[PDB]
Structure formats: C-alpha cells, structure tokens
Chain length 267, copies 4
C-alpha cells in the first residue's frame, strides 16, 4: 500500500460527498491507519464514517474553539496510543457565510462574516499545524485543500480571498513544519459536485448563479487537456495521498494542481 | 502636470515618512487637487499635511468605523463641491499587531489580532472602494500599496498573509470598479525606510530582527538591476501617480512592481 | 509632453495598423523625437511613416542581419547627431512562420521555422539591446511587445513559446541594461485587430480558426473588468509611452499588462 | 512497486551522476520495465546502464536527427514487443554551448549556439512526444526535467531562456497528449552535483563561477524549509516516479517543484 503503516489525521468529513471522505477511503485502501476529526454534527459523522473500509477513532474539533485545539494533541495520542505519532495531517475544512460567497454583492459582505470565513478556511491551517506538529514524525506531511484563487471569478468572492490567504499561510506553515522534518502543501482541486454545488446548479441560488456554475464546469472540462469530471472525487483523493506518501519528499510550501490541467490553458 | 485637474483622495499620512505623504506631494506637484483622510491623530496629521506643497481638506476616516465609511462619500462631496467627483483614490493603509509581525512566532499570533490586521490592511480596500466608487468619474483610478507576498519570508509573518489577501481583494474590486469605468491596481513597493523600519534597523525589535532587515535591504539592492534605495520613496510615489494618470488606461486588477526589478531576479 | 525632449528609437512599423505606428504617433504627440527602423519593405514603410505627425529618420534593420546590427549604433548616431544618445528603444518585432502558428498541428512545425521565429521574436530583443545600450542615456527605457504566454491556447502555438522565451530574455536584458541606468520591460497587450487578425476572422485560415479567434476576442472583452476593444490600439501605445517616461522609474525586468485586466480574471 | 508492470522510456543517461540514471534506478526498484535511449557514446553508456538494477534495451536517439525520430516508435515497439505500448516517457535532456551558459556575457552568445541549445533542451520535448504518443497507453505520463526560470540569475543565461521555452512547450504538449489520455509535466529540480556541477565548484570555469554556484547552493539549502542536499538526486528521481505513477492522475501541463520548497521562500 502507498501509505502502509502511516498514521494520518483527516479532518473535514461531514457527508459521504465530502472530499475528505474520499481522501480517507483511498488512504485506508492504501494501508493508512486514520484518526478522523469532525465538527458539530458528530452523530451524523459517526454514521458516515462507519461506511469507510476500516475502523478509525473520531475526535471532535471545532477549529474556532481554543480548548479543542489546546487538547487536540493529547486526544490524538490517546486515540493512536502513547509512543505513536502521526505521519500525516489532512486539512479539508472551509467555510464562508453566504454574505461573502454566492449571490450577495462582493461589497456587501460584513467583515464579521468574512473574518469567520478566514478563521475557518485559512488561519485554522496554521492552528492545526501548531497543535499537531509536536506529535508528528520526521518525514511527515500536512496537506490542505485549495481552489486556485490567482484570478477573480463570479460568486466565489470572499472565499477566493480566503484561499489566497490560505496559500500564504501554507508557505509559512512550511517554514515551521520543516523544523520537524515535515512537509506542508495544498492540493488545488477543480470543481467537485458536492451536495452544495449540485443544489446551486439545480437553482438554489437562482437562475443566474446556476448558469454561472454550469459555465464554470463546462469551461473547466473544455480547458483541461485530460478533461475534468466534476462528479469524480477520486483523482483529487489520490493526489492528496501522493503528497502524504514518501514519493514527493522534496516538495513543501507548495501547491499541486489536481484540476485536469485546466489552470495551464487559457482556452 | 501629469495629474492636472484630477481630484484624488489620499489616505494613510501619519508622518512625513509615510509613503502616502510622498504620493500626496508628487500628485500636488503634478497638478492634482487632493482630499486627505487621516486616522485617530487628526491634529497631529494636520500639522504634517501643512507641509505639503498645497492646501487640502483633511477628513477623518477610521476604516473599522462603519459610520465613518457610511458618511465618507457625503463628506468628500462637501469638500470638493456638489456635482464633482473623484478621479483617483489612494489606499496607503496597513496595520498588523506585533503578535502577528516582527519577532513573535508565526503560530503565536491570536486570531483576534490577525483579524484586525486583515480588516485594516485588506478588507478596507474593498470598503473604501464601496464608499467612493459612487462618487468616482469614468476613467478614474484606485491604487493600493502592496509588498510582494508570493513567497514567505522572516518576520513579516501575518502581514504577508494580509497582503496576499489584499492582492485577491484588488482583483474583485477591479470587477466592481469596471462597472464605473474605473481601474483598481496595487503598487508592490520595495522596502522603504519609514520611521518604523529605521527603528527596527536601529535595534528596537532586537539584534536579530535588525540583522534580518539589513540583510533584506542589502539583498534587495543587490538583486535589483537598477538598484534600490530604501531611503528614497519618490520612485514609489511616481509609480502610484503613473497609475492615477491616463497613461495606464488598460491595466486593472493588477500589480505594478516599484521594487527596482528585484522580484524578477533570483540572485 | 510626457516624453518632451526624449530621443526614442521605434522598430516594427510595416503598416498604419502596426502597433508600432500607434506607439510612434503617441510618442510624437507627447514631444518625443523619433528614429524609426524597418525591415524589407522600406518604400512601403517610407510612405506610411510620412503620415506620422512629425519627421523622423528611417533606418534599415533586419534583426537577423549581423552587419545591420553591428552598424546600427553608428547609423543611429549619424541620424540623431554626434553628441546625442537615445532615451528610449521600442522593440515591436515578431514573426513565426505559419508552420508554427495558425492551423498547422503543433507537432508539425519544423525546427528551422521555429528557430527563425525565436530569433526574430525573442533573441533580437537581446541583440537590439546589445547594439543600442552603448548609445543610451542613464534613465532610459527599453520596451518590447508581448502576448501573455503563461497558459497554452489554440493556434498561437510556437509563437506562444517564442513569447515565453522573450519574457525570459527581458529579465536578462534588464541585468545588462541596469549597468547603464536603463530599464527593460515588456508590455503584454490584449489582441489587436491588425490586418492579419482581421483576415483570419474573415476566414483566411478556415472556418475553425476564424471561430477560435472570434471566441478569443469575445472572451477577452468579457473577462476584462474595463472591457477590451480589439480595434483600438491607443491604450497599448499609451502604456508603452508610460514605460518610456520617467513615471515608472523603479520597474525593470518586468511585464505590464495592457489587456483590460483580462489576465486577472478567470471568467 | 509504485510502477509495477509499467513500460517506461528513459532518455538522458550519460554518466552514473545523470539525473536520468537515478530516475531509471528508482523506476526499476519500483517494478518498471525500461527502454533506455542514449546519444553519441552508446558503448560508453552501455557500460553505465549495466550498473542499473536490471537489464534494459538501449536505443540510439540524437534528438536533432530527424531519421532517429522517424524510426523511434518502430524501434521501441521492436524492443517491447508488437502490441505493447509505453506507459511513461522521461525527457532528461539538456544542452547549451558555453557561449550561452557559464562565464560568457549574455549578449555574446551567437544565435546559432542558442538555437542549438533550444532545439535540444526545449523543442525536443515536443519531438519526443510526437514520436512516442502514437505508442503510448491511456493513463500514461510524459515527464521532462526543468530548472525554475521564472527569475533571471547569474551564469545560467540562455539555458534559463531554454527552460522558459520548455515550460511553454510542455503546456502545448499537454494539449496533444490529452488526446491520448496521457499527461505531460515537468519536474523543476533544485541544483544537483552532477559531474559538470562538481567541476564548476572545483574551479573549472574560474574562481568567480565557482563562488557563484557555491552561493547558489548555500542559499538554496538555507531557503528550503526542509533543506536541500545537492549531492542527493534520489528526492528528484522519486518525484519523477510519482508523476509516472497513477497517483497524480489529474495533473497535466504542469510543473512539480522538487527543490526543498526553496522557490516558495524569499529568504
Ligand atoms: N467542492 C469543490 O469544488 C472544491 C474544490 C476545491 C477545493 N475545495 C475545498 O475542499 C475542502 C473540503 O470541502 P468540500 O467540498 O469537501 O465541502 P464540505 O462542505 O464537504 O467540507 C467542508 C468541511 O469543513 C468543515 N468545517 C466547517 N467549519 C468547521 C470548523 N469550525 N471546524 C472544523 N471543521 C469545520 C465542515 O464540517 C466540512 O466537513 C474545503 O477547504 C473546500 O474549500 C472544494
Ligand atoms: N514601508 C515599506 O517598506 C512598505 C513597502 C511596501 C508597501 N508598504 C505599504 O505601504 C502602505 C503605507 O505604509 P507606510 O510604510 O507608509 O507606513 P505608515 O505607518 O506611515 O502608513 C500606514 C498608515 O495606515 C494608517 N492606518 C492604520 N490603521 C488605520 C485605520 N484603522 N484606519 C485608517 N488608517 C489606518 C496609519 O495611520 C498610517 O497612516 C501600507 O499598506 C504598507 O504595507 C510599506
Ligand atoms: N496584434 C496583436 O494582437 C498583438 C498583441 C500583443 C502583442 N503583439 C506583439 O506586438 C508586436 C508588433 O506586432 P503587430 O501586431 O504590430 O504586427 P505587425 O505585423 O504590424 O508587426 C511585426 C513587425 O515585425 C517586423 N519584423 C519581422 N521580421 C523582422 C526582422 N527580421 N527584422 C526586423 N523587423 C522584423 C515586421 O516587419 C513588422 O513591422 C509583435 O511583437 C507582436 O507579437 C501583437
Ligand atoms: N544538474 C542540475 O542541477 C539540474 C537541475 C535542474 C534540472 N536539470 C535538468 O536535468 C536534465 C538532465 O541533466 P543532468 O544534470 O542530469 O545532466 P547530464 O549531462 O547527465 O544530462 C544531460 C543529457 O542530455 C543528453 N543530450 C545532449 N544532447 C543530446 C541530443 N542531441 N540528443 C539526445 N540527448 C542529448 C546528454 O547526453 C545527457 O545524457 C536536463 O534537462 C537539465 O537541465 C539539471
Ligand atoms: O520586523 C518586520 C520589519 O519588516 C520586514 C519585512 C520583510 C522582511 C523582514 C522584515 C526580514 C526579512 C524579510 C515586521 N515589523 C514589525 N514592526 C513593524 C512596523 C512597521 C513595518 C514592519 C514591521
Ligand atoms: O556555470 C553555470 C552552472 O550552473 C548554474 C546555474 C544557476 C546559477 C549559477 C550556476 C550561479 C547562480 C545561479 C552554467 N554552466 C556552465 N557549464 C555547465 C555545465 C552543466 C551545468 C551548468 C553549466
């Protein structure tokens, strides 16, 4: 297995459509022993994670809760066993209130909402690394999920800004992680039809917003030299596992694009 | 003059070492009619702005104060006269608490501090554009100040993250501004010996922090094919005035580097 | 005038639709004294340049002709007068045989054709700088024309590769130019309806190639926050003049995008 | 093994210090069946490739020789068996005459020399893909070797330009390759102490050139958050094998940096 014997924490499962669910599934397929973290709907997440190939401890983690972060390393160690450390960490956490993303005008997002989104989507990458680097092994890997924010685009609005901030945070986390012999990287994924995305295409945010996302997806598959299937999360999960493995050992502070090559093509 | 007859709002003067002071001076030299905004210490900044070549109304603007932002367009119009609009806006505002920039470890910055720095340094570019675009003329120009954050570096820490966010914000502000026939761009400046920077070189943050910024400056001038004089703000001021002028009419959502070409050279 | 008293060499006029023709016209409008260079069709170019606002010496320059390059500085000095030097140089020269650009498959371009295109479009920027830096004044400016090649695209093929090479060459020319107190930069322009482009939209290269360029142009104006008028070269000429002026004094080895902000927007 | 059962062509072995030698070794360790190509000194390179873990056919390929390219697919098929195709191709080929790289002034490189370097270092990536895509399986992978040319630097001169061109070529090769379900990517490696590089550090190009590459290496390891050991090619070889594997299936037209994260850090 690509990740045989590795202990990997995976955050961000809320449904079986979560990118984190597929990351977890592929990692287990490849021999990893997981610890999972979830937020808020733990009963729901327990039932979901029971559908993974293998058993894994589930720990509560609200990244805005300072006490959860302060206790996380101790709680992980209790879950994986004293004398064991993590080899991998997956951050698959993002949030921006609908005032900052969707149909609301860019200028009408109140800062308190933007600030909450940046806390969860960008700052928390640093706070999770702070909590977990003390219990990570040399050769380990931290991976976060990104959406290429180098150009502006309709609807994504302040979530784009949060991803820009995340990319910056990743480069600083790499500095810290390197002291432990750990890599930090992001995977910038193409669009994936989560339940939220399928609701928007179906008209949840109105006719315009539905047309804009359809146009995004059509164009994405068009530009990608190898195509892009927004219904298939597996290529993204595999890429995360590649970064968690020993096969990209000289890559850190970086961004790997799992997007069909769309970002390399203008039209 | 390059800016003859243009009405330009300039924020961010606090001392005569402020980059905004030099922007204001060069703009007035080139025929612009200015409106100034200042934060907190208005009596102090009145005495500073009295040293500009020409008189200009000074308005209070704390960018975290929703009431100041709601009233700003009306107060500007009162200053410049009913029926008149602005041709230019300069955002030269930045702030990050010392928990997020300087000698404090990257992981030890509390989010409340980071959030305040992002509010003032990045979000407020959008807030100022929201307030002022309704009173800007077609062909106008919004310019903000940047420090290239595409790579991590010592000390600058979360202010780097805030600049990464600002760059993303500028691309969205360009979308909104374009509806009014207005451009939005940032100038990424090399290091300038403001009073803060001269205090750091002089040892205010310790021997190490002093050594790091000296190494930055030495290396910057070395890499810059035309050199870089950190004691001369005029090249930066001129570049801002170039973007305020009619001579870059097809550039928006962009970043102009006034950095001696340092960012184009590895070594 | 923005360029009052400056002596500026402008290459690349072949018709009154050449971007170089508009650069020359705006520069003369702004007080510059020009020297023009042309290739091959000098009788044609003489009649064209007679339509500029003001008189200007026309010198022959085939950039692949080593003797033309070896004599160019002497010939310029003879044209502008002993004791006078240039303040500016415009490279507006590009060429790629139709085996390397248009409808021919990317893999079917013979290297001799690609090599000729790279010589003219990229290497010649260095060879013109070598010839002319010895007769340029401190504070001077060399500007070349670019088309953003950071992503692949239909049809442009090996001309894209040539522009990628040009961007690299510009960063090295900046190193050399800086020794003379001279800046080197490129202007990356959006698409402009030259006679060649209008022929292609009209069907000269077939129905597919016509549809692809139409799609390029439509999308360009759509993405640009301030729009993009492919029939109007003036915004590009002005940007070149901004770089030739004293108002971007700290920018070198760089690329300024005169493209309506299209490259900053995904959709 | 990571590459179990895959048939992979590897070019660019000339010594056991070649990056291609290590790529070949790691690929064989991971179960790949190789076909090797060599230039000029086949008897010499037979003796070198005899030191790989396993036997592999060695085919002659001078990438400037049109007849070698025309026959290559047939010769590969003969080696691997009728009905069998390649799953991977490695381009590890580079060349720039000393007039274009080293101690010679940038402006003193004759175009004939630059053109030869671009032919071998950049164009041949396309030529090899043209020859081999017709005998590549869906899901296959083409990988070329890069040195980040986004910024200028001492000494590397026109080889930097050739790498800039290669990066552009890779994005076009991705377009073609995608028609076959094949990916095309480059690995941008940090500096590796090949026999050429060790000769330069030892003084072969003079005291200055020696001092410049020592300064490069020192700075590279300093900037890299996980360090950079120029005497260890294995991290680079592994990264190439990661791209040859099934674990980066949605990455194409792209660049993976196996450089210790140096390019993500300013200082
Ligand atoms: N869906 C796409 O098209 C796409 C593509 C690129 C990358 N991404 C990124 O992938 C990641 C996963 O998103 P997804 O598409 O799987 O959506 P999702 O809604 O399934 O996942 C987001 C996760 O963040 C968690 N979260 C929210 N607030 C939290 C908090 N306070 N503490 C801890 N966890 C919290 C949610 O519970 C959820 O599990 C995000 O970072 C997202 O921005 C999404
Ligand atoms: N000095 C440098 O080396 C350098 C280089 C690159 C860019 N910059 C940028 O230039 C801009 C100006 O900084 P500077 O170096 O002239 O320093 P400065 O301290 O003189 O300017 C910062 C300004 O921001 C104002 N400000 C802070 N909080 C505010 C608030 N709540 N509301 C309104 N205004 C507020 C301050 O009063 C001050 O006038 C900043 O964005 C900075 O990041 C600085
Ligand atoms: N037209 C566009 O859409 C567009 C946009 C971006 C930039 N550009 C670039 O702008 C520049 C000017 O192109 P244009 O659109 O004005 O087309 P053009 O055909 O008018 O100009 C190209 C010029 O190169 C000259 N040239 C060719 N071979 C030469 C040689 N051996 N020696 C000297 N001069 C030689 C030609 O005579 C001609 O004057 C080029 O570098 C082009 O690639 C074009
Ligand atoms: N050494 C480094 O620091 C470094 C770092 C980044 C990337 N690279 C790249 O890695 C690749 C391999 O270089 P290397 O350092 O292993 O050196 P090397 O000299 O061992 O490899 C270069 C290879 O190119 C081959 N070659 C030259 N002309 C050829 C032709 N006409 N036809 C076919 N093959 C030809 C040579 O025989 C040799 O095998 C190159 O692209 C190089 O730019 C090198
Ligand atoms: O020490 C820093 C001063 O800048 C910088 C920026 C970049 C780099 C360094 C220092 C070291 C190498 C890279 C942070 N910092 C702390 N207080 C400050 C007040 C004003 C401005 C900056 C301030
Ligand atoms: O000297 C150079 C050796 O590389 C490099 C690369 C980058 C940089 C330097 C040197 C100095 C700082 C930046 C060119 N060079 C000359 N002969 C060579 C043979 C093999 C490889 C390179 C060769």
């Amino acid at each position: 297995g690509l990740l045989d014997g590795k202990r990997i924490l995976v955050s961000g499962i809320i449904t079986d459509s979560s990118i984190a669910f597929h990351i977890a599934r592929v990692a287990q397929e490849q021999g990893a022993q997981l610890v999972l973290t979830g937020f808020d709907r733990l009963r729901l997440i327990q039932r979901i994670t029971d559908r993974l190939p293998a058993k894994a401890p589930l720990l509560e983690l609200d990244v805005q809760n300072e006490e959860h972060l302060a206790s996380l390393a101790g709680r992980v160690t209790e879950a994986i066993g004293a004398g064991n450390k993590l080899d991998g960490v997956v951050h698959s956490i993002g949030f921006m209130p609908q005032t900052g993303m969707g149909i609301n005008p860019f200028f009408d997002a109140p800062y308190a909402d933007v600030s909450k989104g940046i806390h969860i989507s960008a700052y928390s990458y640093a706070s999770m690394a702070k909590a977990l680097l003390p219990i990570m092994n040399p050769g380990g890997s931290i991976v976060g999920m990104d959406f290429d924010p180098s150009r502006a685009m309709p609807a994504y609005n302040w979530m784009t800004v949060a991803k820009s901030a995340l990319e910056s945070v990743n480069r600083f986390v790499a500095r810290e992680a390197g002291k432990y012999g750990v890599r930090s990287n992001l995977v910038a994924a193409g669009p994936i039809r989560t339940l939220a995305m399928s609701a928007i295409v179906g008209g949840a945010l109105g006719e315009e917003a539905g047309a804009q996302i359809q146009l995004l997806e059509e164009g994405w598959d068009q530009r990608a030299p190898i195509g892009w299937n927004m219904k298939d999360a597996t290529p993204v999960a595999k890429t995360v596992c590649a970064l968690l493995s020993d096969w990209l050992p000289a890559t850190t502070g970086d961004i790997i694009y799992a997007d069909g090559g769309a970002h390399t093509q203008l039209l």
